Amino acid sequence: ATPSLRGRLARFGNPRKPVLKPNKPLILANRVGERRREKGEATCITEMSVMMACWKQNEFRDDACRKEIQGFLDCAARAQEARKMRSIQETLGESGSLLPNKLNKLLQRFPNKPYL
Amino acid sequence: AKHLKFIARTVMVQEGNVESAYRTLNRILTMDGLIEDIKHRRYYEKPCRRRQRESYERCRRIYNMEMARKINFLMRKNRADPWQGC
Amino acid sequence: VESFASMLRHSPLTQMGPAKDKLVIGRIFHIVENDLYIDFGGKFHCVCRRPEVDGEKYQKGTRVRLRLLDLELTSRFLGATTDTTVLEANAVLLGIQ
Amino acid sequence: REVLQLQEEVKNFITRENLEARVEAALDSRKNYNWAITREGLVVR
Amino acid sequence: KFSIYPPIPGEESSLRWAGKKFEEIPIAHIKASHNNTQIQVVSASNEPLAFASCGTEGFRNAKKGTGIAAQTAGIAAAARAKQKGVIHIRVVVKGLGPGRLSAMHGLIMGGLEVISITDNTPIPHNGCRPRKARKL
Amino acid sequence: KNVLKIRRRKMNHHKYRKLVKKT
Amino acid sequence: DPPPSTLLKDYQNVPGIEKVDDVVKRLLSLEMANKKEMLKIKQEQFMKKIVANPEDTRSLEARIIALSVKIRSYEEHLEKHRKDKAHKRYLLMSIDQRKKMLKNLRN
Amino acid sequence: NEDLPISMENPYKEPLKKCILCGKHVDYKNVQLLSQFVSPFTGCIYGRHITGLCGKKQKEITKAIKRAQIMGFMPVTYKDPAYLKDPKVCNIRYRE
Amino acid sequence: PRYELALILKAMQRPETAATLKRTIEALMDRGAIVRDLENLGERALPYRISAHSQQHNRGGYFLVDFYAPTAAVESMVEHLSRDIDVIRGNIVKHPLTQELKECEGIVPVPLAEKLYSTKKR
RNA sequence: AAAACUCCAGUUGACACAAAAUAGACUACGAAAGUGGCUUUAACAUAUCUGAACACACAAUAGCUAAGACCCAAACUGGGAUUAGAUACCCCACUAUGCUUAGCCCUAAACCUCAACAGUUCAACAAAACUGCUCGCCAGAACACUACGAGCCACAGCUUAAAACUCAAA
Ligand SMILES: [Mg+2]
Ligand SMILES: [Mg+2]
Ligand SMILES: [Mg+2]
Ligand SMILES: [Mg+2]
Ligand SMILES: [Mg+2]
Ligand SMILES: [Mg+2]
Ligand SMILES: [Mg+2]
Ligand SMILES: [Mg+2]
Ligand SMILES: [Mg+2]
Ligand SMILES: [Mg+2]
Ligand SMILES: [Mg+2]
Ligand SMILES: [Mg+2]
Ligand SMILES: [Zn+2]
């Protein structure tokens, strides 16, 4: 249920102070905002941590901690492939709902009418 | 401080999924608006700005809920073109 | 000669009363992939998904039974002066005959 | 009706002559104001 | 079957963790500030068992306010709790800094077992006025 | 609207408060 | 000042009053009641003492007696609660409103 | 003329929707019902969009909750664990 | 008017509990009250540690005193309860069953605001 | 980052004269200012309307006088950063001040810049266009929230409020 707009704005005839002060006229646009990007991640940090622990506990010798090293490299490879998969996934289809461009096509077929 | 020490905001881990438990904890705090309260009460917000913010958020809620009623009301007509060549 | 007031009073869309939850027979008149474009009388057509059970007994001309939730399906939004009609009614397909 | 309803009720009021017996009766009794509502508007005592 | 809600101290509770009920499992407290994360392990009767933090583990100034620093501090605190004999732990976090889950992960990597997560972050019901907003 | 008239009156007021302090 | 042992207006016409127990007399008296009820009685007593037909409640004289009771109440308040500026406005507005009705009856 | 319509107040008019507590007496001693309209983990009073109470009832439940918690009847920061078992009437969903 | 006294008393035994209930009710009638009823909501754990009269209380016995008192007696009753060291928390309210319940026709639906902006092109 | 603190930090327990999460997606009360923790008492003018800038009563914040309170915040000030400088923005510390009581001072972009009462359905932007009636105000820019006079518990104050010179625009 949408919050009401009955006596919330500063209008003629309203006996009240304005509840809301909208900086833009509260009318639905024919547009939907574009999809925001994802942000910084800092991936592979935990494995990098486990790798660098071995190094300082073992005079910085790789042959000492091959398994931790391999964990860091495989986390890096999986992170890169996750990046590629996620890029192609967000290009392919938005999860659950529809793409902003196609929703804008829909809103262009049934436009808002603030006039008469 | 004067309540019972381990009931409030307490989630239990299941099987060993601590990640399915912290995410849950952050979700109750987000859903009850605790997290945004902490972020907003790190620095004092002067009451003029309190009113301006809490009016912009309410106008945003009204507008967002209206485009959502419109997007759902018209997602039925996103069916294939019934008369392709007009 | 019957007057339009008589035509209306004794008519079946004026004896139906409130359309919600009233069972109505309709005829498929167009099919796109699996969207069956049916009628039921009324000003608008309803569009229903193809029921996968018996999913070949739904062709152009088949008489089906519908629940009916609405007859026009419209709504006014934030800045609108008029309603946003979808030019389609709303019904749930129960089955055939 | 209000006056007559109040008349019948004053006979059961705590006085100086009723105090210890009524205190002990209260100490043996228990009233529960707790009740829960359902999704349907029905009380589940 | 499973409950997110914890056991009420005064009641029957079939859930156990190596003999101990819910109320005698030791408690790890993680204060997660914007510049530091401090983890202290105490017993159920408040006997200190382990205390580690980013400044303790070596990160000096602004590198303290990182997830890796809280992970290292959690590993060290879990190590000292293991030498004091602690396996199971109930985690209480106070704050919203970078290293909250990082300190939790540091404790699990160090080898302690988390059974409950509590959040005691201070929220006044409008008490003391905070600092002025920065003109950053 | 801009605040240019307000700016002129603001600068007028500042110079006055400085004269009363100075004299 | 009506005595604390007086009886509420709504209840002062109930046929069984002198036989009721003293606890019931105390319970519907003015001791165990509020100040707004003393003012109803002071407005009907003053009513019986001044006006012709105390059953109009729509006349100039009746309206002056009603405003005059609020003015004593606004005055009695402003004597304990001295810094109550809101009720000081009501009193001074009401002293002014009595004075107006008074004039129109004088004329 | 006989089949022309006639002025009447709307039949098929559904009776107005009523609130879960419409006609019941909210009391501050009823910490079993007040607890239902609070949050299990934080004790946060729920809004209208979760409770589904009318304005009169959201006001009476809020005032009774505040009265009981300052009077020593209700916990402030949690829902008394004894009541995390009663009939749920609130439209909220924490677990997944 | 009619008042209700919500009284959280100390966790005690029967003779001391009868003694303090007697003390409070005699204080009421000495202040000029006609007491209606005594109720025992019962002894339970407190929602929080109420510290009163140099003690830290964890449990308490909940009682109700329904009474009538003059308008100028509630303050003296509050002072007496504040000085009683067996009372954990006493609070006097106007009795709820003196406010009459209004009939609710139901939830009157609210529409979408209209004529909030002009019909210019814009 | 430095300076600062290490009479420090974490858990726990005692503990306010400060401030009032959530509710609040509610739109209420008040003349305006303003009012959102709980309880109680008192209490929210006018059975036409308009009307005091010759009156009376109020009026956020800041400020003054006197006596108290002290968690936190913080003009000023000092220290540390920055910079060409940095009397700033960033960090740390601390005061006047914010609180209470008593008295002043009487100002705000005190603006929803949209007067009260009664009624109706197009310059541009903005919050569609008007009718009756009444009061208040306004008449190129700047000089000018200024000078002078008067009044005022105000004495670096407030209200009221010009003119000369200049311009052909604002
Ligand atoms: Mg604007
Ligand atoms: Mg240093
Ligand atoms: Mg205070
Ligand atoms: Mg007038
Ligand atoms: Mg005036
Ligand atoms: Mg300070
Ligand atoms: Mg100070
Ligand atoms: Mg002032
Ligand atoms: Mg103006
Ligand atoms: Mg006027
Ligand atoms: Mg000025
Ligand atoms: Mg001047
Ligand atoms: Zn209702």
Contact (CB<8Å) D39/H36: no
What are the beta bridge partners of residue C90? Answer: C70
CB atoms within 10 A of CB E21: 14
Amino acid at G106: R
φ and ψ at residue G28, rounded to 5 degrees: -100, 5
The residues in A 93-112 lying below 8 A from I, measured between CB atoms, are none
Residues across chain A: 116
Classify residue A91 by its DSSP letter. H
Query: Whats the size of chain E, residue-wise?
Result: 136
**In a domain? residue I43:** yes
Give the β-pairing of C63-66 and E113-119. Answer: unpaired
**Coil, helix or strand at residue A99:** coil
Handedness of CA B45, B46, B48, B51 (dihedral sign): positive
Tell me the CA–C1' distance in angstroms for B52 and J33.
20
Residues on chain E touching A42 (C-beta within 8 angstroms) = 67
Q: Does the CB of E122 fall within 7 Å of any strand J atom? A: no
Tokens 């009016």, residue located: B55
Nearest to I81 by CA among I29, I27, I18: I27
Chain I residue with minimum CA distance to A114: I119
Nearest C-alpha in E relative to H78: E5
Interhelix angle E100-110/B19-31, nearest 10 degrees:
160
**Contact check, Cβ <8 Å, D43/H24:** yes
Which residue's C-alpha is at the least distance from the C1' of J43?
Answer: G87
Domain holding I48, by residue range, is 2-94
Tell me, yes or no, whether I74 lies in a domain.
Answer: yes
Nucleotide with the nearest C1' to E127 CA: J19
Cβ–Cβ contact D33 with I under 8 A = yes
For D10, D13, G6, the CA distances from G20, given in Å and listed in that order, are 11, 15, 14
Q: Does H40 touch chain E (CB under 8 A)?
A: yes
Q: What DSSP character marks residue C61? A: T
Q: Which two tokens stand for residue H18?
A: 């009523």
- DSSP letters for chain I: -EEEEEEEEES--HHHHHHHHHHHHHHHHHHT-EEEEEEEEEEEEEEEEEEETTEEEEEEEEEEEEEE--TTSHHHHHHHHHH-SSEEEEEEEE-GGGSPPPPP----------S-S-----
Q: Cβ contacts of residue G32 below 8 Å, gap of 6+? A: G26, I1, I34, I68, I69, I70
Question: By C-alpha distance, which of I32, I29, I31, I38 is closest to I4?
Answer: I38
SS3 of G5-16:
CCECCCCCCCCC
Round the CA-based radius of gyration of chain H to a whole number and report it.
Answer: 19
Residue ranges with strand state E in chain G: none
CB of E40 within 8 A of CB of E48?
yes
Cβ atoms of residues I102 and H54 within 8 Å: no
Could you tell me the CA-to-CA distances from I94 to I65, I67, I74 in Å, in that order? Answer: 12, 10, 10
Q: Which of residues 48-67 of G touch strand J (CB under 7 A)?
A: 58, 63, 66-67
- CA–CA gap between residue B19 and residue B34 (Å, rounded): 20
Q: CA-CA-CA-CA torsion for G10, G13, G14, G19, nearest 10 degrees?
A: 120
Report the DSSP beta bridge partners of residue I55: I52
Q: Which of C70, C63, C72, C75 is nearest to C21 (CA)?
A: C70
Q: Using CA atoms, how far apart are residues C35 and C21, in angstroms rounded to an integer?
A: 22
Domain-located, residue I54: yes
Which residues of chain A are within 8 Å of residue B70 when distances are taken between CB atoms? 28, 107
Ligand lying nearest the CA atom of residue F1: 1
Nucleic chain J contacts, protein chain I, residues 8-37, CB cut-off 7 A = none
Amino acid identity for residue E45 in this structure: S
Q: Which of C88, C26, C92, C89 is nearest to C60 (CA)?
A: C26
Question: For E83, phi and psi rounded to 5 degrees?
Answer: -70, -20
The partner residue sitting opposite E8, judged by closest CB among H81, H94, H95, is H81
Across chain B, where does the E strand assignment appear? 10-12, 43-44
Nearest alpha-carbon partner for E117 in E135, E99, E104, E98:
E104
Beta-strand runs (E) in D1-45: 36-37, 43-44
Residues sharing a CB contact under 8 Å with residue H91, sequence separation 6 or more, in sequence order: H49, H50, H52
Tokens of A20: 């809301």
* Burial status of residue D14 (CB atoms within 10 A of its CB: 0-12, 13-18, 19 or more): buried
Where is B43: in which H helix or E strand?
Answer: strand B43-44
CA dihedral A36, A39, A43, A46 (to 10 degrees): -120
Q: Which residue precedes each gap in chain C (C to N above 2.5 Å)?
A: none
CATH code at I25?
3.30.70.60
Helix (H, G, I), strand (E, B) or coil at E32: strand
Is residue E64 classed as helix, strand or coil in its secondary structure? coil
Structure-token pair, residue E14:
């079939």
d(CA C65, CA E30): 63
Which residues, other chains included, contact D30 with Cβ-Cβ below 8 Å and sequence gap of 6+?
Answer: I40, I41, I42
Q: For residues E92 and E28, is the Cβ–Cβ distance under 8 A?
A: yes
Count of structural domains within chain I: 1
Helix (H, G, I), strand (E, B) or coil at C75: coil
Q: Judge if the beta carbon of H42 is closer than 7 A to nucleic acid strand J.
A: yes
User: Is the alpha carbon torsion for B58, B61, B63, B65 positive or negative?
Assistant: negative
Q: Which candidate, C16, C18, C56, C12, places its Cα nearest to that of C36?
A: C56
CA E61 / C1′ J96 distance in Å: 35
Q: Which of I19, I87, I18, I79 is nearest to I52 (CA)?
A: I87
Structure tokens at C54: 């018996």
Distance CA A77, CA A71 (A): 10
Chains D and B touch (3+ CB pairs under 8 A): no
Contact residues for G66 (Cβ-Cβ < 8 A; gap 6+): G43
Ordered DSSP codes for C11-56: STTSSS-S-TT--EEEEEEEEETTEEEE--SSSS-EEEEPPSTTTT
C76 touches chain I (CB under 8 A): yes
What is residue A35's DSSP assignment? Answer: P
Residues in chain H: 96
Tokens at residue E4, please?
Answer: 């997110």
Using the Cα atoms of residue C14, residue C16, residue C19 and residue C24 in order, give the sign of their dihedral.
negative
- Name the residue type at position E82: K
HSE (side-chain half, CA atoms, 13 Å) at H62: 12
| Residue C74 DSSP symbol | -
Closest CA to C45 of C61, C67, C30, C60: C30
Which has the closest alpha carbon to I25: I10, I13, I35, I16? I35
Distance of CA B72 to the CA centre of its chain: 19
Taking CA atoms, what residue in B is nearest to E2? B14
CB contact (8 A) between residue E5 and residue H95? no
> Which of D35, D39, D40 is opposite residue H32, by nearest beta carbon?
D35
A96: left (phi over 0), alpha (psi -120 to 50) or beta: left
Q: What angle do CA A91, A96, A100 make, to 5 degrees?
A: 50
Q: How many CB atoms lie within 10 A of CB A42?
A: 9
| Residue C61 burial (C-beta neighbours within 10 Å; 0-12, 13-18, 19+) | exposed
Q: What is the DSSP-derived secondary structure letter of residue E7?
A: P
Across the interface, whether the CB atoms of I18 and D19 are under 8 A apart is answered: no
CB within 8 Å of H15: residues ≥ 6 apart = I106
CA distance C33 to chain B (A): 8
User: Tokens at residue F4, please?
Assistant: 């240019």
- How many Å from the N-terminal Cα to the C-terminal Cα in chain E? 51
Residue-by-residue DSSP string for chain H: -TTS------TT-PPPP--TTTTS---TT-TTHHHHTB-TTT-PBP-HHHH---HHHHHHHHHHHHHHHHHTSS-SSS--GGGTTSPP--------
Q: Which of D10, D23, D35 to mutate to probe the I interface, most I CBs <10 Å?
A: D23
Query: What token pair was written down for F16?
Result: 């006055």
- Cβ contacts of B59 within 8 Å, gap of 6 or more: A20, A22, A23, A26
- Could you tell me which residues are beta bridge partners of residue E132? B44
Contact call for residues G25 and G5 (beta carbons, < 8 A): yes
With beta carbons under 8 A apart, name residues in chain D contacting H25.
none
Q: With H, G, I as helix, E, B as strand and everything else as coil, classify residue E30.
A: strand
Nucleotides of J strand lying within 7 Å of any protein CB atom: 1-2, 9-16, 18-34, 37-47, 52, 56-59, 71-75, 89-92, 98, 102-103, 109, 112-114, 125-129, 142-146, 156-157
Tell me if C8 and H3 make a contact (CB, 8 A cut-off).
Answer: yes
Contact between I14 and I106 under an 8 Å Cβ cutoff? The reply is no
Question: Are I38 and D20 an interchain contact pair (Cβ–Cβ within 8 Å)?
Answer: no
The distance between the two most distant Cα atoms of chain H, rounded to a whole number of Å, is 72
Looking at the complex, report in whole angstroms how far the Cα of residue D32 sits from the nearest Cα belonging to chain I.
6
How far lies B83's CA from each of C36, E47, E128, in Å? 13, 78, 67
Q: How far is CA I32 from the centre of its chain?
A: 19
Q: Structure tokens of G72?
A: 């004593």
Selecting from C76, C77, C79 the residue whose C-beta is nearest the C-beta of I117 gives C79
Distance CA B57, CA B45 (A): 15
* I116: closest CA of chain C, how far (Å): 8
- Name I44's bridge partners: I60
A 10 A CB-CB count for D7 gives 14
Question: How many Å lie between the centroid of ligand 5 and the Cα of residue G94?
Answer: 19
Q: What whole-number distance in Å separates Cα of residue B49 and Cα of residue B61? A: 18
Map tokens 């009832």 to a residue.
H57
Residue with tokens 């592979």: A44
- In this structure, what are the phi and psi dihedrals at residue A63, rounded to the nearest 5 degrees? -45, -20
Q: Name the one residue in this structure whose structure tokens are 């006085």.
A: D15
Q: Report the 10 Å Cβ neighbour count for B64.
A: 10
Instruction: Look at residue I68 and tell me if it is in a domain.
Output: yes
The distance of Cα I75 from the centroid of its chain, to the nearest Å, equals 14
Positions 1-60 of B with beta carbon below 7 A from strand J are: 1-2, 5, 32-34, 37, 44, 54, 58
Residues with Cβ < 8 Å from H73, sequence gap 6 or more? H28, H29, H31, I6, I47
Kindly tell me whether chain F and chain D come into contact, counting contact as 3+ Cβ pairs under 8 Å. Answer: no
CA distance G82 to C28: 83
Here the tokens at position H19 are: 């609130």
Residue I41 CB partners (closer than 8 Å, separation 6+): D30, D31, D32, D33, H29, I62, I63, I64
Residues I79, I87: contact at Cβ < 8 Å?
Answer: no
Going from the C-alpha of I91 to that of each of A28, E119, H34, H93, the distances in angstroms are: 52, 33, 19, 37
User: CA E27, CA E117: separation in Å to the nearest integer?
Assistant: 10
Distance CA C84, CA B70 (A): 9
Q: Is the CB of H24 under 7 A from strand J?
A: no
Method for this entry = cryo-EM
* Contact yes or no for E106/E77 (Cβ under 8 A): yes
* DSSP type of residue E33: -
CA distance linking residue B21 with residue I81, whole number of Å? 47
Whether I112 is in a domain gets the answer: no
The chains in contact with chain B, meaning 3 or more Cβ pairs closer than 8 Å, are: A, C, E, H, I
Whether residue A26 contacts residue B59, with contact meaning beta carbons closer than 8 Å, is answered with: yes
User: Which residues from D are below 8 Å from H when comparing CB atoms?
Assistant: 33-41, 43-44
Question: Within an 8 Å CB–CB cutoff, is residue I1 touching chain G?
Answer: yes
Asked if D15 and I28 touch (Cβ cutoff 8 Å), the reply is no
Q: Are E70 and E90 in contact (CB under 8 A)?
A: no
| Domain extent for H29 | 1-96
Local structure of residue A42 (DSSP, 8 states): -
β-strand pairing of C93-96 with C35-38 = unpaired
Residue whose token pair is 């000042």: G1
Question: Given an 8 Å threshold on Cβ–Cβ distance, is B71 in contact with A32?
Answer: yes
The answer to the question of residue I76 being in a domain is yes
Q: Could you tell me which residues come within 8 angstroms of residue E84 by beta carbon, excluding any fewer than 6 positions away?
A: E41, E49, E50
Between CA A19 and CA A30, with CA A24 as vertex, the angle to 5 degrees is 125
Tokens of G9: 């207006």
How deeply is A6 buried, as exposed, middle or buried, from its count of CB atoms within 10 A (0-12, 13-18, 19+)? Answer: middle
**Residue A113: closest CA among E107, C84, G54, E40:** C84
State the nearest residue by CA to the C1' of J20.
E126
What's the CA gap between A58 and G39, in Å, rounded? Answer: 94
Specify the number of domains making up chain H. Answer: 1
CA distances from H10 to A96, E1, E93, I107 (A): 42, 52, 60, 18
Cα I62 to chain centroid distance, Å, stands at: 11
| Residue I104: burial class (beta carbons within 10 Å; 0-12, 13-18, 19+) | middle
